[PDB]
Amino acid sequence: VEEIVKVSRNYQVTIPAKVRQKFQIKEGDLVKVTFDESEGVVKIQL
Amino acid sequence: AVEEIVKVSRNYQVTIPAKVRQKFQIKEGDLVKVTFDESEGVVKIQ
Amino acid sequence: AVEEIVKVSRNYQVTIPAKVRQKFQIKEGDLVKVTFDESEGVVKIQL
Amino acid sequence: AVEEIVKVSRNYQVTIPAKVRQKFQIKEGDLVKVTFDESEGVVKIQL
Amino acid sequence: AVEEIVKVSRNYQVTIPAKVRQKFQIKEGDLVKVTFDESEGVVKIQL
Amino acid sequence: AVEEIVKVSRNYQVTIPAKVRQKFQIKEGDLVKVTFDESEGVVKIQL
């Protein structure tokens, strides 16, 4: 479950609908955004 | 860790905050890949 | 040394950590030679 | 030698092939150490 | 600047790191010109 | 000039050739700074 997205103004990233089936975020929700040094990726967690 | 709390915007977007972008150097308009990692139960942005 | 403990993934796949890849620069589709070194008891990965 | 050619997988993973695994017995979930060997300029995987 | 520290490898080789290659796109097998700039006292690599 | 054409090696390595090394006296294990110089469009390698 992988999709390419374009980063929006003010560095916003859509979480695509196919990803959200597994990660069900809603307007208003708090998420933790982390840089993972081990893999060199950003992680988003609920 | 380099972590921040972000509130999910309208239309299911997540801002990548400045502190995170110091290590993950995306620019407005960039393409990125958004994946659900099942093992860890997080979204990865790569 | 630049190294990390990693958990093996499905289908016997091993993630090469980002700090290791700074020195050993691989991308999907690259050919590598994977060898078992008996003397050292390790697997070696070469480009 | 026990060697095989492997194509790097998505997300910077390398498959450990069956011929290599006859000598280096790993599977999904196992812990391994992945290192960059500076002297040889290769990646090594150790149990 | 786009700069990185590299340790000279065996046989007098220098890795061109990924951040530098975003600007200087070289591939294995490519011809490049290595020059000593006598006045600045540095090496320069050109395509 | 002291210049020579070389072929890029695996893992994006460049050999610093012998005629260059007579002037830029590097050795396995030395640290060097590798920079992309935009003005000149070259990679610089400095001790």
Cα of A17 to nearest chain B Cα, Å: 9
Q: Which domain holds residue D30?
A: 1-47
DSSP conformation class of E16: -
| Distance of residue E10 Cα from the nearest chain D Cα, in angstroms | 7
How many domains in chain A? 1
Angstrom resolution of this structure? 1.4
Query: Are residues F5 and E44, on separate chains, in Cβ contact within 8 Å?
Result: no
Burial class (CB in 10 A: 0-12, 13-18, 19+), A2: middle
Instruction: Give the β-pairing of A30-36 and C2-7.
Output: unpaired
Given a contact cutoff of 8 angstroms between Cβ atoms, the answer to whether A29 and B8 are in contact is: yes
State the smallest CA–CA distance between residue E37 and chain C in angstroms. Answer: 27
Element (H, E) at F7: strand F2-7
In chain C, residues with a C-beta closer than 8 Å to the C-beta of F12 are 25
Q: Which residue has the tokens 């012998």?
A: F18
Provide the β-strand partners of residue D15: C13
Contact yes or no for D11/C16 (Cβ under 8 A) = no
D15 with C11: Cβ contact below 8 A: yes
B–A contact (≥3 CB pairs within 8 Å)? yes
The residue in chain E having the minimum alpha-carbon distance to the alpha carbon of residue F11 is E15
Residue F33 contacts C, CB cutoff 8 Å = no
Among residues C15, F9, A22, F41, the alpha carbon closest in space to that of C7 is found at C15
Instruction: Give F33's contacts in chain E (Cβ within 8 Å).
Output: 3-6
What is the CATH classification number for the domain harbouring F7? 2.10.260.10
Residues ≥6 apart with Cβ < 8 Å to F29: E7, E8
Instruction: Provide the H-helix boundaries in E1-47.
Output: 18-21
Decide if C18 touches F, using CB distance below 8 A.
Answer: no
Question: Which residue's entry shows tokens 């190294």?
Answer: C3
